[PDB]
Design a binder for these strands. Sequence first.
RNA 1: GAUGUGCACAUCCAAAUGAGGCGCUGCAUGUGGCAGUCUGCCUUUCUUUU
Lengths: 321, 237
Amino acid sequence: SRVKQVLADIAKQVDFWFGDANLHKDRFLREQIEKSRDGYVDISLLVSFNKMKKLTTDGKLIARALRSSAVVELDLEGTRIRRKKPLGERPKDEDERTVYVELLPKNVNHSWIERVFGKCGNVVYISIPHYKSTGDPKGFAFVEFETKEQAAKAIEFLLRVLSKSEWMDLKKEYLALQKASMASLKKTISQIKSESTGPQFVSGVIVKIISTEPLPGRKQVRDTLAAISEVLYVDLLEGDTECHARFKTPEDAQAVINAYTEINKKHCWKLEILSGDHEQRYWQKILVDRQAKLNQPREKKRGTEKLITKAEKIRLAKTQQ
Amino acid sequence: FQYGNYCKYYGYRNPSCEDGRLRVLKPEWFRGRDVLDLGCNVGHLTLSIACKWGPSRMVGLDIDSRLIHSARQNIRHYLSEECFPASLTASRGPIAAPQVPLDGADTSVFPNNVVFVTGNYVLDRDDLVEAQTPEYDVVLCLSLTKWVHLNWGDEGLKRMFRRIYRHLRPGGILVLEPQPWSSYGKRKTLTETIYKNYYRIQLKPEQFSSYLTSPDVGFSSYELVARPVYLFHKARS
RNA sequence: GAUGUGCACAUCCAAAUGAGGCGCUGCAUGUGGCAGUCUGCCUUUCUUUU
Ligand SMILES: Nc1ncnc2c1ncn2[C@@H]1O[C@H](CSCC[C@H](N)C(=O)O)[C@@H](O)[C@H]1O
């Protein structure tokens, strides 16, 4: 019967969620067990999980499914379920029993692995890492076999299969070799280098630019304004139609606003010199932006990316020279 | 993606295996010759040329700055051949470090010659094209004409061919393989500018063989030897 | 890469990744950072079969 099969699936999912494996690995449901008196949880909590939704939404049919069951028990009403066998420390032998497998066909399913490995041994727990929540298998899996002999059997039975300890040793060897190569090249770059209150308030340096079209990027505006006078800052929001420029001397701002040929005819811009209250509010905005950028913590950049970018730039420089 | 840049078809394999093209070309022009390569995405062709034919120098050039990073990943993949699980090489990176030359060192050893530069080859102004100087001996421009054509019109396409005329030294040749006219219409609705410049096309892929012979560019003679493969020669000395 | 119509038109899908997690300095800094810190460290990972 199909109802019999649904009762069996509810029994298997509850006996897995209460098996030793998932209780050792998962922390959430173990906190649900631990943060109770007499070690219980309501079945309505178990309904809310994702794989329970595909089977049944009735809790009494779940309680009927847990009548004949190895490790779960019911207390009075068929609304709460307890572990029935007390749990202790994590086993040490599971780290030796664990099996790493590679080259998955990218169709990842828990039943997929259970079919292909269940004949070899009693598969107890599966780990499949999703592509950063994009619902895609990364291409490798961790399958845990029971009693540590069936795992050694399944290694011999087989698409690339190895132990956990061998994987950890290859990981340490890989990481040490990369550290040695980067240390030597770090020394080579060092030897090549060895052988070879903020801005002052000035009145009349604030040019506000208004545009009908959306403005081009800050590199484009900086290349436009720098070719005429000396620019200190380009205040430009991405997507805004207006911007500001702060210059070193007021003569620079005068040379920019009197550059009607190079600016206003090429780009449909209205550039004026702010003064008075607009300039005071803009310099207060400069103070706020400076205090904000100071109060912000420093951005993080990985050391290996910074070192490989420096080496790539020196490679281009020494090839062009 | 607008320019035609594909992050796909990544190659684990070393130069021994290539993506088809290299049985067609003849190695006689490459050896001891400075080479520019336009429209390279991961250099799976660039590395596999530089690996055997031993070109003296080879500068790949591409617009997608995100993708030249993966090309440099592929160049560091060859040095670290000194099995390892793919789950680790995906997350860490390749073992080797980016091979930097000493000041007193021997070039033309694979890979020490090649470098990958990111830039835009269409300068959009004829005055900037006329200022340029010849620097290279063989220029490869294959499977590029369609995307530059639809993105910058006959104006940018004329600018690119006039720039390729300015960067060949005397005796330097050009290799070409253009996309046919029948293809372009399946890509017209990607953006607005592609559609507008597609309905502003006045130049067919056939008259390329006319237009490069025309004095506005200045190539002297040409041939086709077996999409077709065109070889253009600048006039000798 | 696929679908309808009679190679042509029209439509659909393109994303075969790498920079993902977390710091310490000591100088600068609305200047959009610079030089170090064991390749700065770690990656079965920004995972809910909770
Ligand atoms: N304006 C431009 N100048 C130079 N290269 C460009 C360009 N616009 C697009 N390209 C590049 O041209 C490439 C064409 S893909 C062609 C395949 C490549 N030649 C190979 O053999 O593997 C794209 O990757 C794109 O990045």
